[PDB]
Structure formats: structure tokens, C-alpha cells
């Protein structure tokens with residue numbers, strides 16, 4: 060049964076889920092309800108892309124690219140606000156706070172993007188729209204190659220059948236990674252992650268009692284996220300050099316500076 | 320009962336680990352602490368170090384860096400067969416689809432090699448030639464062109480990895496976990512693999528709780544290290560592509576080119 064130590068871990072899991080709901084406006088729970096049948100407008104081609112711009116709201120390979128960078132900056136702001144709620148984070152060296160965010164945000168972005176994905180497409184614009192995976196992979200130049208790695212990860216990640224209360228702790232574990240390059244004081248970070256890892260283990264045991272070694276299987280997914288990011292950074296360098304008229308927003312540019 | 324089988328699995332893998340890998344971490348540790356090894360710290364000590372068995376573990380008919388690289392390839396070829404033997408001792412492995420056995424080894428051996436290489440490293444150097452020698456980290460970093468950043472990423476990993484203070488009994492299970500990875504490309508029947516890895520993970524968790532009762536969340540921390548290994552390995556493959564392209568010897572014996580078809 061529960062015991063003073065495991066009780067403290069339940070309170071932490073409760074606090075993190077709470078802050079997650081407050082920081083992220085589109086939960087997995089809402090995303091799943093939308094995807095499994097309010098209904099979204101579906102963008103699968105050129106004309107439907109124009110019908111949708113009116114219903115929800117090449118220059119088109121560029122309009123999708125910049126929809127995805129505007130999106131990703133919103134997520135960084137949400138993640139940064141969530142990070143403040145992880146007990147101990149705001150007390151860390153401000154420079155290590157920046158480093159942990161710089162290296163953590165994209166691994167979290169792709170974790171949470173999976174919540175909005177099924178094998179056929181991804182929800183957009185707060186779930187008012189749904190853009191098909193075939194439409195995205197049909198884009199020209201390198202733009203058709205960007206979103207396919209994410210779908211591949213999402214389909215396998217989603218088979219773990221995690222809910223928002225599990226993910227709230229998992230993304231906190233991600234942020235508080237002591238191996239990040241350039242961290243000045245690793246021990247206080249590792250102490251916090253030790254506590255989050257304990258909280259996640261108990262959460263998964265209680266929330267998925269029939270799911271053997273879910274904890275370990277989830278931790279192994281950090282390998283797939285790390286590879287998605289480095290693959291993405293490389294594609295962005297290509298876009299930069301081939302499309303000298305396109306703009307990368309200073310926030311994402313600074314996150315990617317001297318990353319790996 | 321279930322714990323009994325998990326302890327029997329751990330003991331079985333340990334026993335098989337001892338039989339397949341001659342230089343254990345325990346033995347390497349003792350050497351690295353205190354028959355002292357011949358130390359190779361510069362060009363002259365390397366030349367004098369024919370105890371590195373370079374005429375044997377390399378072909379006659381070259382510059383230092385190339386010859387060292389060829390020596391590491393010979394060592395990796397040896398390790399691949401030790402790892403292969405060990406894999407066949409893992410319960411369930413040989414009963415897998417034979418194509419899947421080949422795929423698991425092909426994509427697993429680089430991860431295993433650099434995990435076990437850490438057993439032979441401290442922050443200042445690495446044991447070589449069955450632990451009879453010791454090549455310093457500074458010397459390797461001093462090699463020209465692409466060869467100077469061959470080993471340094473592995474040292475960085477080994478320093479982090481060794482702070483976990485695993486022993487051979489722990490490492491035996493960990494290595495089996497790596498081999499039974501169901502996400503390797505081209506696998507034909509993922510289910511039995513993930514079922515076996517599930518069992519190995521359970522055995523690893525119990526082993527670490529009994530062997531390191533005071534070390535909080537060591538299981539989780541060890542699993543997170545697989546993220547670093549994978550980045551170590553991808554980086555390493557790209558460097559071999561720069562070497563294969565730029566340091567080609569067109570006089571190289573064609574059979575030696577078939578023997579080293581895969582570079583490690």
C-alpha cells in the first residue's frame with residue numbers, strides 16, 4: 060500500500076499534471092476525442108488548403124513551413140511556462156535553466172506532437188484542422204521530407220497508450236536532464252530528475268498495472284526523440300542555404316545555434 | 320518464484336559473460352588501479368611498443384595514425400565474435416528467425432563494443448592488447464587529420480558511464496538488453512524479441528536493486544545512457560565514411576578489403 064515516501068511522489072505527480080493542463084491548451088485527451096470522432100476541416104491538397112484558410116485561419120511549401128515555425132515557437136513559450144512549475148527548476152543557476160530549455164524543448168515538442176497525430180495526419184490550429192500525411196510528404200524540394208520522421212515516431216510512441224498525466228511527468232524528466240552540454244552544476248539537476256523518475260515509475264505502475272516494463276520502454280523512446288531532432292536540424296540547414304529568402308525566427312535560431 | 324527465474328537468468332548471463340569475454344571489468348579495474356602495463360604515451364613509446372603486436376594484428380605493406388586505426392579494426396573484429404558467442408547464450412536468442420539474429424547482431428555490436436570498451440578506460444587512457452598495454456588519451460587525441468577525434472568521444476562517454484559503478488554481473492544483463500532491441504531496421508518478427516528484452520529488463524531491474532540498494536534510480540539512469548551510446552555510434556559511422564572516402568589505399572590487398580568489409 061501507500062507509505063510516506065510513495066505518498067510524496069503522488070503529490071508531485073498530481074502537481075505536475077495540474078501544471079500541464081494549465082500550460083498546454085490542447086491536451087492529448089482533447090486531441091484523441093477530435094481524431095476519433097468538434098470535427099476538423101481536413102486539408103489534403105491545394106484547393107482544400109485554400110478552403111481551409113477561410114474556414115479556420117512554391118509559396119505553399121513555404122506557407123506550410125512557416126505554419127510549422129509559428130507553431131513551434133508557441134510550443135516553446137508553453138514549455139517554458141511549464142518548466143517553471145517543476146519543483147526546483149526556477150532555483151537553478153539561470154544559465155543552466157537556459158541550457159536545459161535549449162536542449163529540451165524540441166524533444167518535448169516532438170513528444171507532444173505525437174498526441175496530435177495518427178498514422179494518417181496531424182491536427183493543426185488548435186485542432187480546428189487536420190492535415191494529411193500524404194499531402195505533407197507530397198511537398199517539393201526538401202519540404203516533403205520534414206514531417207515523415209515525426210509520423211514514424213508518433214505511430215510507435217502512441218502504441219504505448221500514455222495519457223496526459225503520464226506525459227506530464229515524462230516531459231519534466233526530459234527537461235531535467237543532467238547530461239546536457241555546457242551545464243555548470245549537474246548535481247542539483249540530477250537530484251531533481253531522480254525525484255521525477257521515482258514519480259514517473261510509481262505513476263506508470265499505478266496507471267498501467269498490466270503493462271510490463273512500460274517505464275523502461277518509455278525511457279528507451281528518448282533515443283528516438285534525440286535522433287528526430289538531429290535529423291531535423293540537418294534538414295533546416297539545407298532549407299537555409301537553398302532558400303536564402305526564407306526567415307528563421309530568432310528564438311528557434313538561437314535554440315539551434317551550436318546545438319550538437 | 321518469478322524472482323527465482325530472474326536471479327537464474329542473471330546468474331546464467333554472468334557465467335556466460337565470463338566465458339565469452341576474457342578481460343572482465345573487475346580484472347581491467349585492478350590493472351588500472353595497481354604486472355604493470357606497457358604504456359604508450361607518444362610516437363617513440365609506440366614504436367618501442369612492439370608488445371602491441373602490430374606486425375601481427377596488422378599487415379606489413381605506413382604512417383602512425385593509419386597503423387593504429389588498422390589495429391583497432393583488428394580488435395573490433397575479435398570483439399564481434401566474442402559478442403556473437405555471448406548472444407547465442409541468451410535464452411531465446413537462437414530460437415529467433417535466423418535473419419533476425421543476424422540483424423540484431425549487425426546493429427548491436429557497435430553499441431556493445433563501446434559499452435565494454437568503457438570497462439577498460441579511465442579518464443587518462445585505455446587498456447590495449449589483453450590489458451598488457453595502456454594507450455594514453457592524450458596520445459590518441461594527438462593523431463593527425465580525422466584519426467585524432469576517433470577515440471575522444473568514446474572517452475567522454477566512458478567517464479560518464481563509469482560513474483555508475485556497474486560491475487560485470489550488472490553489465491552482463493545490460494549487454495543482453497542492448498542486443499534484444501526490437502527497433503532495429505529490417506526485423507521480421509519483432510514480438511519474440513521484445514518479449515525476451517522485457518524479461519531481460521526485469522532481470523536487470525532486480526539485479527540493480529539487490530546489487531546497488533543505495534543507488535537511487537540506477538536502472539533508469541542506465542537506460543538513459545543508451546541515448547548517448549546511439550549518438551556515439553551514429554557519429555562513429557559518419558567518421559568511417561570520411562575515412563573510407565579520403566584514406567583509401569589502392570595498393571591494399573583485395574582480401575584485406577574483404578576481411579574488413581565492415582569497419583568498426
Ligand SMILES: Cc1oc(-c2ccccc2)nc1CCOc1ccc(C[C@H](Nc2ccccc2C(=O)c2ccccc2)C(=O)O)cc1
Pocket residue numbers: 122123124125126127128129130131165168172181182183184190202203205206291311
Ligand atoms: C505539420 C503542421 O502544419 C501546420 C500548419 C501549416 C500551415 C498553417 C498552419 C499550421 N501545423 C502543423 C503541426 C505542427 O507540427 C510541427 C512540426 C514540427 C515542429 C518543429 C519545428 N519545425 C519547423 C520549424 C521551422 C519551420 C518549419 C518547421 C517544420 O517542422 C516543417 C514542416 C514541414 C515542412 C518543412 C518544415 C522546429 O523548430 O523544430 C513543430 C510543429
